[PDB]
Chain A
């Protein structure tokens, strides 16, 4: 088997599109679903929407632009939903923001999102001659000063460690990614049809195995933006626009016996919370340390 870089991307997107078509071809034929607003602004507000098509974002378009722009994450019953996930049965919806009193749910949803971006930054930035295997997106708590992604690289490429030029280029391509506006999309896949998309990454295939194993229906949660697809835990933030300052700060070589795993550590803030040029240097200092919470 011999594969081109663009071919694999296309194939993944085709698998994903086949998925979508198969999810939509369930023939709901526009069934009426009912949502209620339990939020504190307009209580006793009802929404008659279209089951498994209409979204909690499409529910914000009824209120005002303010909701559309401010709300990162929806709290529907006992679950956070992300804005672009269609809705299943009758629900009750509350909207979450960065300035709310228990933003934590959103915060976890930020790092996850932010981490995923740095995937695109990396895999596509390498020479055709080498090989980049993305491993997992280890979830650190927010008090640790960074977000981290795990990466394995070609064995002959393993001796050199990055230069401030390379780092700055990572940052630059990240911000260039933020520049064009990318929506985030959520799909529910079976382990059988999920294991076919990732393939060549063994760590993806095994992570999928464990993750889908712990939950009885063998369900994998996929997140697609642009040409990139990634499996993660929990919901993501609605648009790429929301991320303002992006930095790829440090990269650290960690070595196990059977694997050489590099951490990519970075820092980012939302356009809502954006911080001053002095503070940014202070936090960009703390993101240089090797930050370990895996378990």
Chain B
């Protein structure tokens, strides 16, 4: 509901807050790399998929420019090292949700990654397992944000990863809901990680999880769902479209 009662209670007066708000992260992902639609099949040939990835890594001028900003601002910087540590961040952060430890979960994931994953999951028991990463993790894209006001620069590194995972969600009474723990399900994930540059303490965080438009449908739920139709008041008749 978007409502303001202007008639009676006025409007909250305009205040100058003596602390300018400090943000470790910024919600938006600047540019979403739109992946090739045949990448389900193209992945069967590794020297094709990884060739296209590496090719578009070398060829992009925007990506190279952001790479240059991160490399000048933060010396001892390698992009061949990144998809390894970025893949480590997963095995750590998913284990963090498994164990429901939010302390270490604040170090890894970004301000924007945290609220969703913690919010909807919090009253249940979640067990997750990383068995195989089938295709070696590739850095697809890099982006740099120039904040003119703060002088702040934000690096964003996309990692695409093929993965094999087992997920079991027990509901708050202990009974299963989403998935079996004994099936090594095949999962492909688009990921974005973030970094604050002007920041003296050099933080690299998981920012967001991107899903392609042609992404395979997820596993079917156990319980039956009932979707109620539009509610009819006393004099309002029902109308049915074709």
Contacts and interface: CB of A to CB of B under 8 A. Distances in A.
A141 B133 CA distance: 68
**Which interface residue of B220, B226, B227 has the most chain A CB atoms within 10 A?**
B226
Interface string B77-110: 0000000000000000000000000000000000
Contact of A45 (B220, B222, B227): B227
A44 B229 CA distance: 5
B230 interface: yes
Nearest to A43: B238
A55 to B, nearest CB: 10
Q: Interface residues of B toward A: which range?
A: 10 to 19
Interface in B137-178: none
A139 B229 CA distance: 41
Interface string A30-42: 1110000100001
Contact of B227 (A31, A47, A54, A63): A47
Contacts of B222: 30
A50 B224 CA distance: 7
B240 A47 contact: no
- Interface of A, helix, strand, loop or mixed by DSSP: mixed
A205 B87 CA distance: 66
B224 A46 contact: no
Nearest to A58: B224
Interface centre among B220, B230, B238, B240 (most CB of A within 10 A): B220
Nearest to B217: A32
B12 interface: no
A216 B71 CA distance: 75
A62 interface: yes
B41 to A, nearest CB: 24
Contact of B229 (A42, A49, A54, A62): A42
Those 7 A-B pairs whose CB atoms lie nearest each other, nearest first: A44-B229, A62-B226, A46-B227, A48-B225, A32-B220, A45-B229, A49-B224
15 contacts: A30-B222, A42-B228, A44-B230, A44-B238, A44-B240, A45-B227, A45-B229, A46-B227, A46-B229, A47-B224, A47-B227, A49-B224, A50-B224, A54-B224, A62-B226
